[PDB]
Coordinates of C-alpha atoms (C1' of nucleotides) in Angstrom, one line a residue:
Chain A
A1 CA -8.6 72.7 34.1
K2 CA -7.6 72.3 30.4
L3 CA -11.1 72.0 28.9
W4 CA -11.2 75.6 27.5
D5 CA -7.5 75.4 26.9
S6 CA -7.8 72.4 24.6
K7 CA -10.9 73.9 23.1
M8 CA -9.1 77.1 22.1
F9 CA -6.0 75.3 20.9
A10 CA -8.1 73.1 18.6
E11 CA -10.1 76.2 17.6
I12 CA -6.8 77.8 16.4
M13 CA -5.5 74.7 14.7
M14 CA -8.8 74.2 12.9
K15 CA -8.9 77.8 12.0
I16 CA -5.6 77.5 10.2
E17 CA -6.4 74.2 8.5
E18 CA -9.9 75.3 7.5
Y19 CA -8.6 78.6 6.1
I20 CA -6.2 76.4 4.0
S21 CA -9.1 74.1 3.0
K22 CA -11.5 76.9 2.1
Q23 CA -8.7 78.7 0.1
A24 CA -8.2 75.5 -1.8
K25 CA -12.0 75.1 -2.4
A26 CA -12.2 78.7 -3.6
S27 CA -9.2 78.3 -5.8
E28 CA -10.8 75.2 -7.4
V29 CA -12.2 77.5 -10.0
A30 CA 6.6 73.0 -3.6
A31 CA 3.6 73.2 -1.4
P32 CA 1.7 70.2 -2.9
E33 CA -2.0 69.5 -2.3
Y34 CA -1.5 66.0 -0.9
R35 CA 0.3 67.6 2.1
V36 CA -2.8 69.6 3.1
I37 CA -4.9 66.5 2.3
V38 CA -3.0 64.4 4.8
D39 CA -3.1 67.3 7.3
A40 CA -6.9 67.3 7.0
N41 CA -6.9 63.5 7.4
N42 CA -5.1 63.7 10.7
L43 CA -7.1 66.7 11.8
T44 CA -10.2 64.5 11.4
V45 CA -8.8 62.1 14.0
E46 CA -7.9 65.1 16.2
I47 CA -11.5 66.3 16.0
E48 CA -12.8 62.9 16.7
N49 CA -10.7 62.6 19.9
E50 CA -11.8 66.1 21.0
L51 CA -15.4 65.2 20.4
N52 CA -14.9 62.1 22.5
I53 CA -13.5 64.1 25.5
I54 CA -16.3 66.6 25.1
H55 CA -18.8 63.8 25.1
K56 CA -17.3 62.4 28.3
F57 CA -17.5 65.8 29.9
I58 CA -21.1 66.2 29.0
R59 CA -21.9 62.7 30.2
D60 CA -20.3 63.3 33.6
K61 CA -22.1 66.6 34.0
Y62 CA -25.6 65.4 32.9
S63 CA -25.4 62.1 34.8
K64 CA -27.0 63.9 37.8
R65 CA -30.1 65.2 36.0
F66 CA -30.9 62.2 33.8
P67 CA -28.5 59.5 34.8
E68 CA -30.2 56.8 32.6
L69 CA -30.0 58.7 29.3
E70 CA -26.5 57.4 28.4
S71 CA -27.7 53.8 28.1
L72 CA -30.6 54.7 25.9
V73 CA -28.6 57.0 23.5
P74 CA -25.2 55.4 23.0
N75 CA -24.3 57.5 20.0
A76 CA -22.2 60.6 20.8
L77 CA -23.8 63.3 18.6
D78 CA -27.3 62.0 19.3
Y79 CA -26.7 62.1 23.0
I80 CA -25.3 65.6 22.8
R81 CA -28.3 66.8 20.8
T82 CA -30.7 65.1 23.1
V83 CA -29.2 66.7 26.2
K84 CA -29.3 70.1 24.4
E85 CA -32.9 69.6 23.5
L86 CA -34.1 68.4 27.0
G87 CA -32.0 70.6 29.2
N88 CA -33.2 70.9 32.8
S89 CA -36.9 70.3 31.9
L90 CA -37.5 66.6 31.2
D91 CA -41.1 67.4 30.2
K92 CA -39.9 68.0 26.6
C93 CA -40.4 64.4 25.5
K94 CA -44.2 65.3 25.2
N95 CA -45.3 66.6 21.8
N96 CA -41.8 67.4 20.7
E97 CA -40.9 67.8 17.0
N98 CA -37.1 68.3 17.3
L99 CA -36.5 65.1 19.2
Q100 CA -38.1 63.2 16.3
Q101 CA -35.3 64.5 14.1
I102 CA -32.6 62.9 16.2
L103 CA -34.0 59.6 17.5
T104 CA -36.5 56.9 16.4
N105 CA -40.0 56.6 17.8
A106 CA -39.1 53.5 19.8
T107 CA -36.2 55.2 21.7
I108 CA -38.4 58.3 22.1
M109 CA -41.0 56.2 23.9
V110 CA -38.2 54.6 26.0
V111 CA -36.7 57.9 27.0
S112 CA -40.1 59.4 27.8
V113 CA -41.0 56.4 29.9
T114 CA -37.7 56.5 31.8
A115 CA -37.8 60.3 32.4
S116 CA -41.1 59.9 34.3
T117 CA -39.1 57.8 37.0
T118 CA -35.5 59.1 37.1
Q119 CA -34.7 60.2 40.7
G120 CA -32.5 62.9 39.3
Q121 CA -32.3 66.5 40.6
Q122 CA -32.2 69.9 38.9
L123 CA -28.9 71.4 37.7
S124 CA -27.8 74.9 38.7
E125 CA -27.9 77.7 36.2
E126 CA -24.1 77.9 36.0
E127 CA -24.0 74.1 35.3
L128 CA -26.7 74.5 32.7
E129 CA -24.8 77.2 30.9
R130 CA -21.6 75.2 31.0
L131 CA -23.4 72.3 29.5
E132 CA -24.9 74.5 26.8
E133 CA -21.6 76.0 25.8
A134 CA -20.0 72.5 25.7
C135 CA -22.8 71.3 23.4
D136 CA -22.4 74.3 21.1
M137 CA -18.6 73.7 20.9
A138 CA -19.3 70.1 20.0
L139 CA -21.8 71.1 17.3
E140 CA -19.4 73.6 15.8
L141 CA -16.6 71.1 15.8
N142 CA -19.0 68.7 14.0
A143 CA -19.7 71.3 11.4
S144 CA -16.0 71.8 10.8
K145 CA -15.6 68.0 10.4
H146 CA -18.4 68.0 7.8
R147 CA -16.6 70.8 5.9
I148 CA -13.3 68.9 6.0
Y149 CA -15.1 65.7 4.7
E150 CA -16.7 67.7 1.9
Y151 CA -13.3 69.0 0.8
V152 CA -11.7 65.6 1.2
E153 CA -14.3 64.0 -1.1
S154 CA -14.0 66.7 -3.7
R155 CA -10.3 65.8 -3.7
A156 CA -6.5 59.1 -10.8
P157 CA -9.7 58.0 -12.5
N158 CA -9.0 54.2 -12.3
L159 CA -7.8 54.1 -8.7
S160 CA -10.8 56.3 -7.7
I161 CA -13.2 54.0 -9.7
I162 CA -12.0 50.9 -7.8
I163 CA -12.1 52.5 -4.3
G164 CA -14.2 55.6 -4.0
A165 CA -12.4 59.0 -3.8
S166 CA -11.9 59.5 -0.1
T167 CA -9.9 56.3 0.4
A168 CA -7.8 57.0 -2.7
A169 CA -6.9 60.4 -1.4
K170 CA -6.0 59.0 2.0
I171 CA -3.7 56.3 0.6
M172 CA -2.1 58.7 -1.9
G173 CA -1.5 61.3 0.8
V174 CA 0.0 58.8 3.2
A175 CA 2.1 57.3 0.4
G176 CA 3.3 60.8 -0.5
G177 CA 2.0 61.2 -4.0
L178 CA 0.8 59.2 -7.0
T179 CA 4.3 58.5 -8.2
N180 CA 5.5 57.2 -4.8
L181 CA 2.4 55.0 -4.6
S182 CA 3.0 53.6 -8.1
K183 CA 6.4 52.1 -7.1
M184 CA 5.3 50.2 -4.0
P185 CA 4.4 46.5 -3.7
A186 CA 0.8 45.6 -3.1
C187 CA 1.6 44.0 0.2
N188 CA 2.9 47.5 1.4
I189 CA -0.1 49.4 0.0
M190 CA -2.3 47.0 1.9
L191 CA -0.8 48.3 5.2
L192 CA -1.0 52.1 4.5
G193 CA -2.5 53.8 7.5
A194 CA -2.4 51.0 10.1
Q195 CA -2.3 51.8 13.8
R196 CA -1.0 49.6 16.7
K197 CA -4.2 49.5 18.8
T198 CA -2.8 48.4 22.2
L199 CA -4.5 45.4 23.7
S200 CA -6.4 45.9 27.0
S201 CA -4.6 40.4 19.2
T202 CA -7.2 38.8 17.1
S203 CA -9.8 41.2 18.4
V204 CA -7.7 44.1 17.3
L205 CA -7.2 43.4 13.6
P206 CA -3.5 43.9 13.9
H207 CA -2.6 44.5 10.2
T208 CA -5.3 46.6 8.5
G209 CA -5.6 50.2 7.3
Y210 CA -7.3 52.3 4.6
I211 CA -8.3 49.3 2.6
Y212 CA -9.7 46.9 5.2
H213 CA -11.7 49.9 6.5
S214 CA -13.2 50.7 3.1
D215 CA -16.8 50.6 1.8
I216 CA -16.2 47.7 -0.6
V217 CA -14.2 45.6 1.9
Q218 CA -16.5 46.2 4.8
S219 CA -19.3 45.1 2.5
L220 CA -18.5 41.5 3.1
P221 CA -18.9 39.0 6.0
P222 CA -16.0 39.5 8.5
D223 CA -14.5 36.0 7.8
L224 CA -13.9 37.1 4.2
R225 CA -12.7 40.7 4.8
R226 CA -8.9 40.0 5.1
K227 CA -8.8 38.1 1.8
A228 CA -10.9 40.8 0.1
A229 CA -8.5 43.4 1.4
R230 CA -5.5 41.6 -0.2
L231 CA -7.4 41.3 -3.5
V232 CA -8.4 45.0 -3.5
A233 CA -5.0 46.2 -2.7
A234 CA -3.5 44.1 -5.5
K235 CA -5.8 45.5 -8.1
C236 CA -5.5 49.0 -6.7
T237 CA -1.7 48.8 -7.2
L238 CA -2.2 48.0 -10.9
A239 CA -4.6 50.9 -11.3
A240 CA -2.2 53.2 -9.5
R241 CA 0.5 52.3 -12.0
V242 CA -1.7 52.8 -15.0
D243 CA -2.6 56.2 -13.4
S244 CA 1.1 57.2 -12.9
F245 CA 1.6 57.3 -16.6
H246 CA -1.7 59.1 -17.4
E247 CA -3.2 56.2 -19.5
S248 CA -6.8 55.1 -19.9
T249 CA -8.1 58.5 -18.6
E250 CA -11.7 57.3 -19.3
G251 CA -11.4 54.7 -16.5
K252 CA -11.7 51.6 -18.7
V253 CA -9.0 49.8 -16.7
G254 CA -10.7 50.7 -13.4
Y255 CA -14.0 49.5 -14.6
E256 CA -12.5 46.2 -15.7
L257 CA -10.7 45.7 -12.4
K258 CA -13.8 46.5 -10.5
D259 CA -15.8 44.0 -12.5
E260 CA -13.1 41.3 -11.8
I261 CA -13.3 42.1 -8.1
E262 CA -17.1 41.8 -8.1
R263 CA -16.9 38.5 -9.9
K264 CA -14.4 37.2 -7.3
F265 CA -16.7 38.4 -4.5
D266 CA -19.7 36.7 -6.0
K267 CA -17.8 33.4 -6.4
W268 CA -16.6 33.6 -2.8
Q269 CA -20.2 34.2 -1.6
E270 CA -22.1 31.7 -3.8
Chain B
rA1 C1' 44.9 17.4 -21.4
rG2 C1' 42.4 15.6 -17.7
rC3 C1' 39.2 17.5 -13.1
rU4 C1' 34.5 19.6 -12.1
rU5 C1' 28.9 22.3 -11.8
rU6 C1' 23.8 22.4 -13.2
rG7 C1' 19.2 20.5 -16.0
rC8 C1' 17.2 16.7 -18.7
rG9 C1' 16.8 11.4 -21.0
rC10 C1' 18.0 6.1 -20.5
rA11 C1' 19.4 1.8 -17.5
rG12 C1' 21.7 -1.0 -13.2
rU13 C1' 22.2 -1.8 -7.8
rG14 C1' 20.0 -0.6 -2.8
rG15 C1' 16.7 1.6 1.3
rC16 C1' 11.9 3.4 2.9
rA17 C1' 6.2 3.8 3.0
rG18 C1' 1.2 2.0 1.2
rU19 C1' -4.6 7.1 5.2
rA20 C1' -2.3 7.7 -0.7
rU21 C1' -1.3 7.8 -6.3
rC22 C1' -3.2 9.6 -10.5
rG23 C1' -6.7 12.6 -14.2
rU24 C1' -8.4 17.8 -14.9
rA25 C1' -11.5 20.6 -24.0
rG26 C1' -13.7 22.7 -15.0
rC27 C1' -12.3 27.5 -12.3
rC28 C1' -8.6 30.8 -10.2
rA29 C1' -3.1 32.0 -10.1
rA30 C1' 3.9 36.0 -10.2
rU31 C1' -1.0 41.9 -13.5
rG32 C1' 0.2 37.1 -7.1
rA33 C1' -1.7 31.0 -5.0
rG34 C1' -1.6 30.8 0.1
rG35 C1' -0.2 33.0 4.9
rU36 C1' -3.2 30.7 13.0
rC37 C1' 3.1 33.6 15.2
rU38 C1' 3.9 36.4 11.9
rA39 C1' 3.8 40.9 8.8
rU40 C1' 6.5 47.8 5.5
rC41 C1' 7.4 40.2 6.5
rC42 C1' 7.1 35.4 3.6
rG43 C1' 6.4 33.8 -1.8
rA44 C1' 3.5 28.6 -5.4
rG45 C1' 0.4 26.2 -6.8
rG46 C1' -4.8 26.1 -4.8
rC47 C1' -10.2 24.9 -5.1
rG48 C1' -14.3 21.7 -7.1
rC49 C1' -15.1 17.2 -9.5
rG50 C1' -13.6 11.9 -11.0
rA51 C1' -10.9 6.6 -10.5
rU52 C1' -9.1 3.0 -6.9
rU53 C1' -7.4 -3.6 -3.4
rU54 C1' -2.6 -3.7 -13.9
rU55 C1' -0.5 -8.0 -15.8
rG56 C1' 1.8 -12.5 -16.5
rC57 C1' 3.1 -16.6 -13.7
rU58 C1' 2.9 -20.0 -9.6
rA59 C1' 0.9 -22.3 -5.1
rA60 C1' -3.4 -23.8 -1.7
rU61 C1' -8.7 -24.8 -1.1
rU62 C1' -13.9 -26.0 -2.2
rG63 C1' -16.7 -29.9 -4.7
rA64 C1' -19.1 -35.2 -8.2
rA65 C1' -17.5 -32.0 -11.6
rA66 C1' -12.9 -25.9 -10.9
rA67 C1' -13.0 -26.3 -17.5
rC68 C1' -9.2 -27.3 -23.7
rU69 C1' -10.2 -31.6 -30.1
rU70 C1' -11.7 -46.8 -15.8
rC71 C1' -13.1 -51.5 -13.4
rC72 C1' -14.1 -56.8 -13.3
rC73 C1' -14.2 -62.4 -15.0
rA74 C1' -11.9 -67.1 -17.3
rA75 C1' -7.5 -69.3 -19.1
rU76 C1' -1.9 -69.3 -20.7
rA77 C1' 2.9 -67.4 -19.9
rG78 C1' 12.3 -79.5 -7.8
rC79 C1' 11.8 -84.2 -5.2
rC80 C1' 9.2 -88.3 -3.0
rG81 C1' 4.0 -91.5 -4.5
rU82 C1' 0.3 -92.4 -8.0
rG83 C1' -1.8 -93.3 -13.6
rA84 C1' -0.8 -94.5 -18.3
rC85 C1' 2.4 -94.6 -22.5
rG86 C1' 7.0 -96.4 -23.9
rA87 C1' 11.7 -99.0 -23.6
rC88 C1' 14.8 -102.9 -21.4
rU89 C1' 15.1 -107.7 -18.6
rA90 C1' 7.8 -109.2 -10.9
rG91 C1' 12.2 -105.9 -11.5
rU92 C1' 14.8 -101.5 -13.9
rC93 C1' 15.0 -96.9 -16.8
rG94 C1' 13.2 -92.3 -19.6
rG95 C1' 9.7 -88.6 -20.6
rC96 C1' 4.7 -86.9 -19.6
rA97 C1' 0.6 -86.1 -16.3
rC98 C1' -1.4 -84.5 -11.2
rU99 C1' -6.3 -86.2 -7.2
rG100 C1' -1.1 -86.6 -0.7
rG101 C1' 3.6 -84.9 1.6
rC102 C1' 8.3 -82.2 1.8
rA103 C1' 11.6 -77.3 9.6
rA104 C1' 14.1 -83.7 13.9
rU105 C1' 21.5 -86.3 12.7
rU106 C1' 23.8 -87.3 5.5
rU107 C1' 22.2 -81.9 2.7
rU108 C1' 17.0 -77.0 1.2
rU109 C1' 14.6 -74.2 6.9
rG110 C1' 21.0 -72.7 9.3
rA111 C1' 26.4 -74.3 15.3
rC112 C1' 26.1 -69.6 14.9
rA113 C1' 27.5 -65.0 17.1
rG114 C1' 30.8 -62.0 19.8
rU115 C1' 36.2 -61.3 21.4
rC116 C1' 41.7 -61.1 20.9
rU117 C1' 47.0 -61.8 18.4
rC118 C1' 51.0 -61.7 14.4
rG119 C1' 47.4 -65.1 4.9
rA120 C1' 47.4 -68.1 10.4
rG121 C1' 45.6 -69.4 15.3
rA122 C1' 43.6 -68.6 20.5
rC123 C1' 39.1 -67.2 24.1
rU124 C1' 33.9 -67.0 25.5
rG125 C1' 28.6 -68.1 25.1

RNA sequence: AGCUUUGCGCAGUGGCAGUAUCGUAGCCAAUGAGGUCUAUCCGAGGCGCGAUUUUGCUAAUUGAAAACUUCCCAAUAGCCGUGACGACUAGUCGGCACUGGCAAUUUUUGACAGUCUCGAGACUG
């Protein structure tokens, strides 16, 4: 009913946002940049949700030809690519070179074995074309997501040294600029970008965002991740302040703080 | 001029508990310790290691001994008789000595004890 409607609405929204992003990328060589950065950050979530609904649609449609494939390929993009590559003919697991670019040899064996005894029936040509167009829409949305992520990475030497460049951009955009970030307590920076995550509480990680879900924090055992978050946030705050005055542009402070964080992690894990 | 607030030091008088007190040329910590109700909120120490039932005094116990310049033998330390010595006329007296005795009316082995009356008497056994 609203499948193509949502597809077109997201196409228009992504067209506007990607025009803005490509204009910024071209211009790389009162309407601040962090505004478009946060816009892209939320558009990423929108794209993820749209990809999820598209994946659900594809699963429901393809569950009559190869009902068992969903179990073997839990990942969304991999499942979409596999259904695109197999189509109505399940005899494409034999001597296939594209399938080896999506899955591992073990799961290729498993899917080939399962396809031989599946009890599924053929799809009509109309259903096949609907599935193909859905897959193409998913792939183009994924390409748009990749472009957004490239721009988001391209977009504060010390704060970036401590935590990447993507997370720094996310936290500064949600804060509303580097100056606004510099004048917040660390306990508030720790909570920038935290959802509510309705229960269906310990299993939800109630108070975590943009620092808990970071490369350097997720790089620890779960039981140490909250403490680490705190620590990182603390040091991040310091770096932010040093950045708000344009001092230590070489990143010396960031390197020192990262070394201290690494020493604390090592001591925790000894 | 008194009254009064906070912190510290020094003493006196009370209460409570010994599963806790102390140390930290070890590490981390307001540039944030620690957050299991409880979080755009709270806000100080934590971790590891180490010591463990002071001293004087007093009391009790163990044992032969519990920690600081006695036992034993010999002898010395009232009268009636008797033996001598002596004195005075068979008798008497004085002192000395020790070889039997000293609860049956005049003495030293208990007519005493209780009671009552106003220094004095009575009653009972």
